Structure 1
Amino acid sequence: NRHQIFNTTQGHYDAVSFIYIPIDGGYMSGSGVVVGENEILTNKHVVNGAKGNPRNISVHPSAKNENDYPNGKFVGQEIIPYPGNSDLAILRVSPNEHNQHIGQVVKPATISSNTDTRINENITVTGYPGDKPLATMWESVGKVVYIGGEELRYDLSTVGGNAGSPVFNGKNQVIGIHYGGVDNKYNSSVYINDFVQQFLRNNIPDINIQ
């Protein structure tokens, strides 16, 4: 089942972040997770449409609802796509209006080495589902179903559009980034394997992998 998170600044929820991009009086919304001093991990397809101007992307770490942004807003500055064919991107944001960096106002997430990740492992997927009220954070309890290459799949536990949402193991470490799935079969995330970890290390000097 899925449940809303109201204590969005406590513990490992602090780094979970709401991503908002306006489009012609509508918008695109998604999720990501703070992983560095100025860096959000998310999907390529969340930020793709703003490659021409990252400043159109608003990031609200620890957002609670559309009227409650406990850690304010950070504006996109640079997008660093993962070079492989996985739906993964680093979004670098500028400091906020008080000159704070996003990695100072939230504790950046811990990335799992994934040495112990296995089928049937209990996981959570936490972020901003597209079928819920705007900017509300939700946690879904799931089970890993497949691990191969850069793909981690888990059971039909999340719905509504969960692009960019971090997948956490039981130690509250990020093992992957939700991007999609196959309808009525499984959900899919970018698996943070050895290849993905090196990409993070190359771009995020203060990355925390445990």
Structure 2
Amino acid sequence: NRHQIFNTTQGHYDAVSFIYIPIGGYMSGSGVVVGENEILTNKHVVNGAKGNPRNISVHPSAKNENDYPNGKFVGQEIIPYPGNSDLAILRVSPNEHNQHIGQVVKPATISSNTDTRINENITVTGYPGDKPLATMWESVGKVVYIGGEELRYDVGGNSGSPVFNGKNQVIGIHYGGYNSSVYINDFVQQFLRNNIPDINIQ
């Protein structure tokens, strides 16, 4: 069961990011900082901006609706994964202090996924839409399926949430659905390397 995170800027939680996109309302979602100016999230999240990346606000380490400890970063370029998975890179502008999103937080470590196997314990950490706005929540779960670019795990996760292994490395990006995530396999990794030259794959 889910537990709220309160020290959102400490340890591996600081790269977990809250996404806000206005529309007669708003869509929210989750993502994870992975590069100097880059986060990962879903295609169906960035699609909410209707082609206009500056409609997307990204709040790394957001703690609640009135506590954005790292401010916000506005989207600059949407880079969707060419393959048929719910993955996109969002490139964000520097903030109103000309700091870079990869400088105010530590970019997450991506897992090579050489050791990832079913029955492994994982966590999914992000901003569930059934909780107060921009509150970070971590759920514990178990990998139950790995195939191609699909990784399923064993309640629900918020669109774009990073999936972490026991080493606090990102093994996948939750996209919906058991729960489904985008498995960061070799093809996904090369996509990341092609676009995020400082990507940290361990």
Per the TM alignment, residue 52 of structure 1 is displaced from its structure 2 partner at its CA by 2.1
Per the TM alignment, residue 161 of structure 1 is displaced from its structure 2 partner at its CA by 5.1
Q: 1:198 to 1:40 in 2, by over 3 A?
A: same
Other-structure match for 1:196? 188
Per the TM alignment, residue 167 of structure 1 is displaced from its structure 2 partner at its CA by 0.1
Q: Distance in 2 between matches of 1:84 and 1:52?
A: 19
Q: Distance in 1 between matches of 2:50 and 2:106?
A: 27
Equivalent position SS for 2:54: helix
What TM-score comes out, normalization by structure 1 length? 0.95
Q: Distance in 2 between matches of 1:49 and 1:35?
A: 21
* More displaced stretch, 47-56 vs 91-100: 47-56
- Alpha carbons 1:39, 1:92 under 8 Å: kept: yes
Structure 1 runs of 4+ with >4 Å offset: none
Q: Distance in 1 between matches of 2:71 and 2:49?
A: 21
Give the RMSD, CA atoms, in angstroms.
0.8
- Alpha carbons 2:125, 2:136 under 8 Å: kept: yes
What TM-score comes out, normalization by structure 2 length? 0.98
- Alpha carbons 1:131, 1:160 under 8 Å: kept: no
Deviation digits for residues 57-88 of structure 1 (CA, Å, limit 9, x no counterpart): 00000000000000000000000000000000
- Alpha carbons 2:18, 2:30 under 8 Å: kept: yes
Per the TM alignment, residue 50 of structure 1 is displaced from its structure 2 partner at its CA by 1.6
Deviation digits for residues 5-38 of structure 1 (CA, Å, limit 9, x no counterpart): 0000001000000000011x41000000000000
Unaligned runs of 5+ in 2: none
Deviation digits for residues 84-141 of structure 1 (CA, Å, limit 9, x no counterpart): 0000000000000000000000000000000000010000000000110000000000
Per the TM alignment, residue 169 of structure 1 is displaced from its structure 2 partner at its CA by 0.0
Q: 1:22 to 1:161 in 2, by over 3 A?
A: farther
- Alpha carbons 2:153, 2:180 under 8 Å: kept: yes
Equivalent position SS for 1:9: coil
Per the TM alignment, residue 51 of structure 1 is displaced from its structure 2 partner at its CA by 4.3
Number of aligned positions between the proteins: 202
Unaligned runs of 5+ in 1: none
Identity of aligned residues (%): 100
Equivalent position SS for 2:66: coil
Q: Distance in 2 between matches of 1:153 and 1:12?
A: 22
Per the TM alignment, residue 49 of structure 1 is displaced from its structure 2 partner at its CA by 2.6
